[model samples]
Target: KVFGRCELAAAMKRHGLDNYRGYSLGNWVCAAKFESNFNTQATNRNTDGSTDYGILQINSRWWCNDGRTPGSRNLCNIPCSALLSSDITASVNCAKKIVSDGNGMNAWVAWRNRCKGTDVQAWIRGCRL
Candidate 1:
């Protein structure tokens, strides 16, 4: 499912991403905008042969197991398919774990390049969440 901007914000909040790990809700929203355009089934194949999955684009290299990434740690303990589900709970959980790592929000290149140290307020502006 492709979510509306505010819809995605509310969903992330429901799953505990609001201000998670010192990154504002807007940071997450901005990453999703560039990473997947709020599309739940979004997937990207990396040059390294790992695939990124879901709205947050969690990578198979470190998070989900697609059964193809050799030596995948599957740190999220979920199939890559799970990240594509309309229910974003699994996706949000994996995203949290990714940020929890030493990389913090920098785990997502989209965030670093597009959202870092910017005025991300617009991403969540007008959303009453």
Candidate 2:
């Protein structure tokens, strides 16, 4: 499921992404925008044999377990498949875990390269936050 911008914004707000851990909702929205375009089923394969899964592109290497990545820490302690769901609950929880680990939003390269140090407000401009 591909989320409309406002739809995703509302969902993220319900999950408390608004200033979650000090980062604004727009930051999270912008990261998801560039990461997976708010598509719930988005997936990507990394050169290091890891796979990024779901909307936020949570990885199998250090976060969710896909049962394929070798020596996965499964830091989020949930299956990677959970991130692929349209509900977004597991995905949001895993994202919070990533940030809570001291990685901040930079855990996602997309966020670093696209959202960091930029005006992310456009990502949620009309979302009525």
Candidate 1 per-residue C-alpha lDDT over 14-127 given as tens digits, one digit per residue, 9 for 90 to 100:
999999998889999999999999999999999989999999999999998999988777999999999999999999999989999998999899899999999998999999
Number of the predicted model whose TM-score against the real structure is largest? 1
Q: Which residue pairs of candidate 2 clash?
A: none
What TM-score does prediction 1 earn? 0.98
Across residues 20-120, which tens digit of lDDT does each residue of candidate 2 receive? 99999889988989999999999999998899999999999999888888887798999999999999999998899999988798888999998999998
Q: What is the lDDT of residue 75 in candidate 1?
A: 92
TM-score of 2: 0.96
| Candidate 2: worst-modelled 10 consecutive residues by lDDT | 120-129
Who wins the lDDT comparison? Answer: 1
Q: Tell me the lDDT of model 2 at 34.
A: 94
Worst 10 residues of 1 by lDDT: 64-73
